[PDB]
Amino acid sequence: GIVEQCCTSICSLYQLENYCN
Amino acid sequence: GIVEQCCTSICSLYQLENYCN
Amino acid sequence: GIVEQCCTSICSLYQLENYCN
Amino acid sequence: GIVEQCCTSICSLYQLENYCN
Amino acid sequence: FVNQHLCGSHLVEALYLVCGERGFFYTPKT
Amino acid sequence: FVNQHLCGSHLVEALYLVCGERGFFYTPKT
Amino acid sequence: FVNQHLCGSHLVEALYLVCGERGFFYTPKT
Amino acid sequence: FVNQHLCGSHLVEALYLVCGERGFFYTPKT
Amino acid sequence: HLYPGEVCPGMDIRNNLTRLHELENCSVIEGHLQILLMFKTRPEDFRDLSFPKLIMITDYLLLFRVYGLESLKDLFPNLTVIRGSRLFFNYALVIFEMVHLKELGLYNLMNITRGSVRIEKNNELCYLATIDWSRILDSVEDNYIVLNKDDNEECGDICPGTNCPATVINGQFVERCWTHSHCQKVCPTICKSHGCTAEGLCCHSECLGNCSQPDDPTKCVACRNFYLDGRCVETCPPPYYHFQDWRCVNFSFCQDLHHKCKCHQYVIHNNKCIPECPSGYTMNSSNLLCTPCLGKVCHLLEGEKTIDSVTSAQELRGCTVINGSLIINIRGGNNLAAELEANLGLIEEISGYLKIRRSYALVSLSFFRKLRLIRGETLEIGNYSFYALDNQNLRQLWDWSKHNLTITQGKLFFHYNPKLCLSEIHKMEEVSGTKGRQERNDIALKTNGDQASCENELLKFSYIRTSFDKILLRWEPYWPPDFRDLLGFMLFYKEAPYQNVVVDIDPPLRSNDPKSQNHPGWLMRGLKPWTQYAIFVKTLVTFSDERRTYGAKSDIIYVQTD
Amino acid sequence: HLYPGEVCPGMDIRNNLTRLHELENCSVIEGHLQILLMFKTRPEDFRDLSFPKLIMITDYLLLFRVYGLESLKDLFPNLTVIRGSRLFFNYALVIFEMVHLKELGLYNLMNITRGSVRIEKNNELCYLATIDWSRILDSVEDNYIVLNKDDNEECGDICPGTNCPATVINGQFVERCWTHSHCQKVCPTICKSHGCTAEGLCCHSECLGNCSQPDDPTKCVACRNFYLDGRCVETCPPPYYHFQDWRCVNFSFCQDLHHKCKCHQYVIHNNKCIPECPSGYTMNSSNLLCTPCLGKVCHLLEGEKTIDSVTSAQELRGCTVINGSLIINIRGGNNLAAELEANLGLIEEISGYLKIRRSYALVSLSFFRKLRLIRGETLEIGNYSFYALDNQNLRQLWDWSKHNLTITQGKLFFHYNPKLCLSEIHKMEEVSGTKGRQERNDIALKTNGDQASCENELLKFSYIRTSFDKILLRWEPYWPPDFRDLLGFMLFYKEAPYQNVVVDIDPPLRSNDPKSQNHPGWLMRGLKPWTQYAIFVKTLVTFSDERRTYGAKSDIIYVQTDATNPSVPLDPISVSNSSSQIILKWKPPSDPNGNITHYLVFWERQAEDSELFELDYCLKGLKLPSREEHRPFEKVVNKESLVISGLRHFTGYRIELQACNQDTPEERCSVAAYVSARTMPE
Amino acid sequence: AAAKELEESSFRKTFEDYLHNVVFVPSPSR
Amino acid sequence: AAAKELEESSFRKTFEDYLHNVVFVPSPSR
Ligand SMILES: *[C@@H]1O[C@H](CO)[C@@H](O[C@@H]2O[C@H](CO)[C@@H](O[C@@H]3O[C@H](CO)[C@@H](O)[C@H](O)[C@@H]3O)[C@H](O)[C@H]2NC(C)=O)[C@H](O)[C@H]1NC(C)=O
Ligand SMILES: *[C@@H]1O[C@H](CO)[C@@H](O[C@@H]2O[C@H](CO)[C@@H](O[C@@H]3O[C@H](CO)[C@@H](O)[C@H](O)[C@@H]3O)[C@H](O)[C@H]2NC(C)=O)[C@H](O)[C@H]1NC(C)=O
Ligand SMILES: *[C@@H]1O[C@H](CO[C@@H]2O[C@@H](C)[C@@H](O)[C@@H](O)[C@@H]2O)[C@@H](O[C@@H]2O[C@H](CO)[C@@H](O)[C@H](O)[C@H]2NC(C)=O)[C@H](O)[C@H]1NC(C)=O
Ligand SMILES: *[C@@H]1O[C@H](CO[C@@H]2O[C@@H](C)[C@@H](O)[C@@H](O)[C@@H]2O)[C@@H](O[C@@H]2O[C@H](CO)[C@@H](O)[C@H](O)[C@H]2NC(C)=O)[C@H](O)[C@H]1NC(C)=O
Ligand SMILES: *[C@@H]1O[C@H](CO[C@@H]2O[C@@H](C)[C@@H](O)[C@@H](O)[C@@H]2O)[C@@H](O[C@@H]2O[C@H](CO)[C@@H](O)[C@H](O)[C@H]2NC(C)=O)[C@H](O)[C@H]1NC(C)=O
Ligand SMILES: *[C@@H]1O[C@H](CO[C@@H]2O[C@@H](C)[C@@H](O)[C@@H](O)[C@@H]2O)[C@@H](O[C@@H]2O[C@H](CO)[C@@H](O)[C@H](O)[C@H]2NC(C)=O)[C@H](O)[C@H]1NC(C)=O
Ligand SMILES: *[C@@H]1O[C@H](CO)[C@@H](O[C@@H]2O[C@H](CO)[C@@H](O)[C@H](O)[C@H]2NC(C)=O)[C@H](O)[C@H]1NC(C)=O
Ligand SMILES: *[C@@H]1O[C@H](CO)[C@@H](O[C@@H]2O[C@H](CO)[C@@H](O)[C@H](O)[C@H]2NC(C)=O)[C@H](O)[C@H]1NC(C)=O
Ligand SMILES: *[C@@H]1O[C@H](CO[C@@H]2O[C@@H](C)[C@@H](O)[C@@H](O)[C@@H]2O)[C@@H](O)[C@H](O)[C@H]1NC(C)=O
Ligand SMILES: *[C@@H]1O[C@H](CO[C@@H]2O[C@@H](C)[C@@H](O)[C@@H](O)[C@@H]2O)[C@@H](O)[C@H](O)[C@H]1NC(C)=O
Ligand SMILES: *[C@@H]1O[C@H](CO)[C@@H](O)[C@H](O)[C@H]1NC(C)=O
Ligand SMILES: *[C@@H]1O[C@H](CO)[C@@H](O)[C@H](O)[C@H]1NC(C)=O
């Protein structure tokens, strides 16, 4: 989930790259 | 004694219960 | 113990009979 | 773009880290 | 239950009301 | 005979009523 | 690149900076 | 780390301070 | 007529106004509509952009972070009704984080049937106090408005004169409008349900909100319940079937809807085109009728679901068997309980455990109607089938008169439940039949039910002495099985003009009970004559870690002085 | 001599005075004496009953529920010293539930060495406020006295006159006595150690309390430390041995004491006849000496002991190995921690678990000196080797600098510990190495340490702005890693003339940090001039069920304010004691408003009134009353008076007086106070 | 006393979370 | 606030208990 990745953990740019198309 | 308990003091029902068998 | 028998449980007259000699 | 990130927004050091090799 | 110092026939009838049945024996030795 | 949990001076007077005479010694070793 | 736990408009602007162009569609079934 | 909108030689020296060593290549195709 | 456009069911729009022209002509959008995440928009991108074609939305509507937009009276001048079947945290109108959005002009909106409105983080919006939600909504106490331009009091949101109704609500006349031009229309106190026309006459008994002619089902604007072919209708005449609580369709339509998942395949029951049948029913190959038979397993995703609102709730609407575990966590602030009951556990079994964490406003669990069994085949960690934490209003679980409970495995976990007293807890242990499982500190014996004296013991007043300046009360001296534990007598006194409902007394000497002359009392001096007082007493005793002697409280008594 | 009677070790007496005659002759009882439970006694059963021979008791003394007795001046006129080796809930004198006991007469009691005195449920006893316990005891704050006849104030516990010392204690003189006859003896402030004689001279350096002759070891009354054959001695000379901290015995004595358990068989160490040897020691077949060797297991009854006082504690005095489990429960109210330390864990191991339940005043655990290993071979129920509950003062467990901890099995149980924050808890988890054991709710994460912000995060002030009526602070805005969790800022302020040591602030918009222009601040208006203030700030954040971000607090800081114009110089009195001298005296102003530099003094020559020059006094009606510009001035420094010289006879004077709290730049000074005066005629 | 405001702020935070959770995964489908 | 008095009363009760526990068993030896 969103805070499960960016607030529980810290998101990477590669993790957010799947949230680019 | 008798007046020592029932007249000097006041007897209780539990005190007189020993004067039941 | 004392309250272990007379306050935790309730003592009997036979239990207190050991506390007569 | 360049002023789109460093003047429109403010660049971060991590954003400029892609502008390191 | 009365809370009073007691003598005479008052005390006698009180004791009979307490005893009812047997209440008292008479064996000091036998 | 009360059927109740007992402490303090209630329990003290109960024990004195049970004992009457001697009741308790104090010789653990002698 | 920040290394920090992110919420709110901080996370919103971070996501917009990551996406830039299209980034996200809305076809779960169609 | 400055938190400010940047242009000109300010931005140039900022980029040189970020890069230090190599920082940027020039191969779009080769 | 009544709806010259089309349906065009709900799809949500992102990142630019390009896909918006897909949704132009359509009269009433089935489903929901969201518009989100458009940073590069301009105020010029809306003056050549308008949709009067939409009048009603079924479920909800959402506006989230789109720049350059300042009003809504152009984009939707004629949206009128929100039904609100599929809701959004008990909201159907989301206006949130909208930079530059300063007004609405949503004057044609008349009734929102089900749901509420939440407004937040919109530091340009005004004209907010000029909106009577009671004309449009029922539960106006479920509307959240914060972080706005109205919250820093600057906007003079006025209109030039009379027009806009200046109605006293709380302190004075509140002028009702949408813009400086658009007043808020108020129908009279007789045309309230179906709406009124322009001069104020009542519409037809099947109209809703607006009607092109007063008292005409063929000349309404919006149907109350159901639509059929230029006529707002009360029900479906044969051979027609209710579809999504708004219209009547034939057998051919809902028939051919089924033929396309070859996703919500449909059936028909109770003259209705519905998605599915409940338990004990069977489809039909001929007409898809929920035929009764002998013998609904809503199998969850990973056997687990956090439940927080109606949006979580309607996914489990009408289920009978739960092949999973449930998590009840509502940081609420409003009682959802009736609508919570409206689509919940007509069930008997839970395969896994049950969790109830940190829910605030849940005073009871009576909305659980038919629940009997917990299988507990997957436990809460720590070997629990049941969980309970931090319930600031929970007092009653159920009435154990007719409510039952069957527990296979697992244990109980009770902490910080400040109005949950231990009597019904032990009753739950009894009716559970799992009393020989709970260890020490499976129940917080300090925090559970520590805000009101509950348990059993009642003080009874032996004697009452009144005056115009003196009060003495005498009651039967209760003594716990350890008489040392009584430390005092807590007394609560006050006056009482109605009957719709502090000092201390030291304990007297016990010392015997043939004649325990220790009937305890307190003298009150602070008396007013002719004055009704409300007095009651609590017994202050010593806590013990064991099964503590619960202590006594007296009755609230009313004493009128001279 | 010094002790004509005998030892007669302590036997306790019940139910009648018949066995009391077994204990007549003996002068110092080893052990203790209890007198208890004689309901069928009479006051006439004590008038023919007296024991002056007893002078000192070693351990303790007890009086419990004996009827008919009213005093102790007859039964024990001459008891003087209580040593208190074996104590009784840190007491040595029990006066309890004694019906008709109305007085003591215990004037000869002089020093109680170790222990205290508890008096309870004795509804006849008086003459108690006349008893200075500080003359007899050291720690007088451990003496509990309640439920007595003095608690319903009726007794006139007086003496006829002078004799009894009326010493001030708290509010006034407290007349010190025992009866209406017996005063309470006070030795002077130099004979305090060994007592004083009748005239008040100091006794010998080995006497105690009383001595028959001043400065005589052969004519004391009670020994301070040790007794040897008509002499109180400082130590045992060879070949004698200290026995029970009071005497010197030969080798044959403690030798033959061993030969009687064939129960406390005895050995010898450090010139002392002792019960047993500690670890690493061995007996001797020749002389029973605790010889050192290679490699003390105090195996409990049922492997378990509830520990509540020194009476519990001395049973494990000197032990090295505990073959059992320990339970610490002291419903207290008094720190026994030093005396607790004095006979405790010179050990390393506990074979079973450890329990700490509902103890009140135990602030620390440092009295466990050498404690290293927890075996936990028998666990607490719930699978614990450790227990902790309801400890209202416990803050530190140990300094983990040099103290260590090894835990074999079991888990940790932390509940209701409002001054025990999670930091040292997790440090104990770390040093234990048993961190991979504890589940959820092995630590109460809502009650443990919830009375003070503890853990790590410290606020740092960036800027300080001061005034005489304004305060602004600026500090670094801390944000937890979820920035939404910051609820607000808790601020505590007060004034503080010493340095031996409420508002809230909304958090600002975070929104960035290249230039997070959000340095938070608060303005105070409520300032007093020249006034020292003490301020500190705490961060209010949202609780989370996980490892919550511990939150910050600020340092306590001290800021004095600036200083305004001082108040009116109070009471100007202008007397002219001579024909040209005028004393002007005054009080300080109500508000000095800073350190007063000086007093600005203006005296102005007022001429005579002009209407008097054109009046005909030769006519009847001759009633004469006997009465910028730089004015002459003075800066009176450090004086509330000023005599003025060079003044006219018969001239009224205006006087304008001010005070001044600032002198060197741009004098901040008071407002004008006025008086008028007249010099004497010549 | 005012702890309902304390949980109300967490309610606001949960409302922040849920919209973000809606926005988060329509895009990763691979 | 005054809970030290509350535990002090229990301390008094414990002191009551312990003397009674001393008085209790020197007598049963059989
Ligand atoms: C907006 O229009 C509706 C149309 O009638 C007004 O009436 C409300 O209609 C709904 C739909 O039937 C009613 O809800 C129903 O409640 C029953 C329980 O009472 C439930 O079993 C049904 O399933 C359904 O949900 C609602 O009670 C009814 N309310 C009233 C006051 O009549 C509505 O009043 C209009 N809104 C305003 C602000 O005028
Ligand atoms: C009553 O007489 C004694 C005799 O000296 C007075 O002094 C006290 O003497 C004892 C025994 O020497 C001292 O106790 C010792 O303390 C040390 C640590 O300080 C410890 O290591 C020893 O094992 C022993 O326990 C005690 O401190 C000492 N007290 C004082 C104040 O000097 C005592 O003062 C006399 N009582 C009164 C009321 O004057
Ligand atoms: C909105 O309506 C116009 C008008 O056309 C009507 O709707 C069409 C879908 C069709 O059913 C026509 O018979 C109706 O009269 C639509 O414009 C038409 O678009 C089609 C392309 O799909 C084109 O071939 C026609 O020539 C257009 N006709 C006119 C009069 O412009 C428009 O596409 C509709 N918008 C949407 C989103 O459906
Ligand atoms: C059975 O119903 C279908 C569908 O109903 C249509 O859509 C509804 C929403 C509503 O608008 C109805 O009035 C419509 O009829 C019918 O199929 C359509 O019939 C209309 C007749 O005017 C025709 O114009 C459409 O082209 C038809 N649709 C298709 C896809 O061809 C059907 O006629 C109904 N049958 C009976 C017996 O009533
Ligand atoms: C208390 O002392 C008297 C006096 O006798 C002294 O103490 C004895 C123990 C013994 O040592 C005598 O030599 C001392 O002179 C005791 O009275 C004597 O008791 C003994 C028998 O016990 C008897 O033979 C004597 O005749 C008694 N003498 C006198 C003068 O009465 C008494 O017994 C001692 N009591 C206790 C409890 O020790
Ligand atoms: C070694 O000591 C013993 C015992 O000492 C006696 O008891 C002490 C409490 C103290 O009172 C000492 O003064 C005592 O001497 C001696 O045995 C006693 O000796 C005395 C001699 O005066 C004699 O009167 C006693 O009867 C003896 N005791 C018994 C039971 O018979 C012993 O003499 C000492 N030996 C040496 C070599 O000093
Ligand atoms: C909770 O209880 C279950 C049941 O005894 C425990 O799970 C068992 O664990 C053992 C070994 O770990 C397995 O051999 C069994 O098959 C397990 N049984 C089941 C039903 O899962 C579990 O260890 C307990 N947990 C706690 C924390 O006590
Ligand atoms: C505490 O842990 C111990 C260790 O596993 C458990 O005791 C075991 O119980 C089983 C069956 O009950 C026995 O076969 C083992 O021999 C026991 N081991 C030991 C070391 O005693 C115990 O069940 C646990 N108790 C709780 C309440 O969790
Ligand atoms: C569930 O409860 C229903 C009502 O219970 C009835 O009333 C109470 C007072 C008890 O006496 C109970 O035995 C009665 O039956 C029942 O109709 C139903 O059978 C219950 N179901 C189960 C599984 O217990
Ligand atoms: C117990 O602790 C003693 C002191 O510890 C010493 O100082 C600290 C700062 C650590 O660095 C520690 O490692 C040092 O040894 C030790 O003397 C002793 O060996 C320790 N015992 C055990 C069993 O760890
Ligand atoms: C005194 O008490 C003892 C022990 O109980 C007993 O043997 C003796 O007979 C008693 N004497 C009298 C006079 O009561
Ligand atoms: C609008 O957005 C869609 C998807 O985000 C993209 O395909 C299209 O090119 C965009 N059009 C314009 C004009 O930006």
Residue numbers in the entry:
A (entry chain O): 1101 to 1121
B (entry chain U): 1501 to 1521
C (entry chain Q): 1301 to 1321
D (entry chain S): 1701 to 1721
E (entry chain V): 1601 to 1630
F (entry chain R): 1401 to 1430
G (entry chain P): 1201 to 1230
H (entry chain T): 1801 to 1830
Tell me, in the authors' exact words, what the paper reports.
Insulin plays a fundamental role in metabolic homeostasis and its dysregulation underlies many metabolic disorders, including diabetes mellitus (DM) and cardiometabolic complications. In the current studies, a novel class of insulin dimers is described that function as insulin receptor partial agonists (IRPA). To explore a structural basis by which the binding of IRPA to the IR might elucidate partial agonism and biased signaling pharmacology, single particle cryo-EM studies were conducted in the presence of RHI or IRPA to examine the structure of IR-extracellular domain (IR-ECD). The partial agonism of IRPA derives from differences from insulin in IRPA binding to the insulin receptor, differences in receptor mediated ligand endocytosis, and selectivity or bias in downstream signal transduction.
Cryo-EM structure for a complex of a near-full agonist IRPA with IR-ECD (IRPA-9:IR-ECD) was also obtained. Indeed, the resulting IRPA-9 bound IR-ECD closely mimics the T-shape RHI bound structure where one insulin monomer is bound to the α-CT helix and the L1 domain, and the other exposed to the solvent with no direct interactions with the IR. Deuterium uptake protection at region 1 was clearly detected for RHI and IRPA-9, both of which are IR full agonists. Among the two regions that show pronounced H/D exchange protection upon ligand binding, region 2 around residues 701-714 (α−CT helix) showed protection across all three comparisons (RHI, IRPA-3 or IRPA-9 vs. unbound IR-ECD); protection at the IR α-CT region in response to insulin binding has been previously reported. Structure-function interrogations revealed that partial agonism can be tuned by site of attachment of the linker (e.g. B29-B29 vs. B1-B1 linkage), and further tuned by subtle end-capping of insulin.
